[PDB]
Symmetry: D3
Subunit: 112 residues, 6 copies
């Protein structure tokens, strides 16, 4: 019931080490991430929906964890999430359907 909470927490504790021990690298990465996700022609929620689809296509539970968490914070609706997942399924078939299930689980977990 706290599967993705644990995944994201555990990754975050390792990432704190990276930020201390590879500070130039992580500063560069942070700049990339912030530039990619900032408000622009596409708003932040829309970019995070794009991120969620990518997370599912890349079959990465950590990404699914963090971006579903962010989507809840950005107040994405369940319907907006499902429709993003549908795009991943169309462009990934069976395996993306499996990770779409995980993304729904993550989103529901972080939704309370």
């Amino acid at each position: 019931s706290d599967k993705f909470s644990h995944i994201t927490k555990d990754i975050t504790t390792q990432l704190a080490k990276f930020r201390k021990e590879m500070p130039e690298l992580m500063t560069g990465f942070s700049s990339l991430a912030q530039a990619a996700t900032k408000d622009g022609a596409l708003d932040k929620k829309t970019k995070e929906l794009i991120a969620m689809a990518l997370a599912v296509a890349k079959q990465c539970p950590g990404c699914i964890g963090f971006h579903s968490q962010t989507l809840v914070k950005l107040q994405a609706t369940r319907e907006e999430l499902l429709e993003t997942l549908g795009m991943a399924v169309y462009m990934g078939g069976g395996p993306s359907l499996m990770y779409a299930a995980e993304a729904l689980e993550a989103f529901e977990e972080f939704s309370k």
Copy 2:
């Protein structure tokens, strides 16, 4: 200068046979594709931006070709494309940058 026109045309020629010879499979596929891309909580343009990011992440010149063509049809702006490519680069690093290049080329080609 006709690079992605030729890529998409050549794929379409092969798929024309596949569609007729595997009609149950491909009516299944087309219905999945239509269901995924239809207007809903997300509009069609937004879903095609998601498709473009996925095409780049999948490193697939054919997908990039078809979805760039569709983005032009849906009148996505250059800036909307750029920002969705930005998300692919954040989630894919160096290799995604190589296919962001292809997406920009394809988009420009189909924009005339």
Copy 3:
């Protein structure tokens, strides 16, 4: 000892939600899946062996779960499974060997 039983059960509960909330999409997907796996020039067991190899190549525990379960139901032998896995290893190297191990574990789990 019930690792893959739990994986598949958990995915199935999310998929029931998808079937209710994205019924056109899941109907389309179901049609695709049924057309792909139905008896033809290749029998159903052979297509599921193909699916198992793909599941291993795609490194997807959910797919490995469901298709190993189906292989047992279709009465695939252990030798037929291993030889399919061998093909994945030849075309995937080290990482596919890791997921081949998981596929054997799944198959043995569902075999009683």
Copy 4:
């Protein structure tokens, strides 16, 4: 019309050097390949159909080229190929369809 002939020939030219300069590696590889593809519980044609599905899932024109050539040698039927491509599409969605196109083209090319 000689597309996959040239792709495979060009790869073979490069690999000819690699095989002589990394002979321990490549005798290791060839023995793995032979062991994987040998007749067993699954016959050779069936294993090459599995290889074709994997080649498509790996989105690799070179693999698609070589394995289509081998399928013709093993006298796989067009319908057997179509059904294995069907499985790749079910497990890969849109992007796999782009490489199913290439597999059909390659198979036709080597069929004369």
Copy 5:
């Protein structure tokens, strides 16, 4: 606290079955692996750092497990590991950062 110990142990028990039941295949694979990793122009530690980067790029917990274990045995430093991981992040973006976190966790686990 013994996550990767369990992953590698469990894979190893299945691999013992493969070695008995597909002895030609596993002999071939073993030859490939030994030729790839043996001392040469690049020493063994350097090749294992290459393996670790590949394991992260391929998002394979099993590979991450075994190669981090080998790196400790080869007395790779923590700094050598982090810098390898940094290369994976540069060429993988967000998702490789997630698996880099897992690789650090694995390395620390096997380091005592």
Copy 6:
């Protein structure tokens, strides 16, 4: 004989636009790339050998092109390249062999 020269030049032409139109993103990216590839516990040549293995594993002709060019600049030996390709083949099987072919071709092209 100018294959990878043209590939890299063509990508660079597209990216020249991308860099100016997404300057926050791409200054972020360049700083990440520089931070990742800088001399440290691993020297620059070693990191570029890691990058080459990753490029091959990602099956990306563009990456293979750019990183082969850089390897020549860093005066990597042919044998150092061969051994890093060996690692990619061990971790990728048949498909990686197809891109090892491309890496050898690119390296030879940029070596003159």
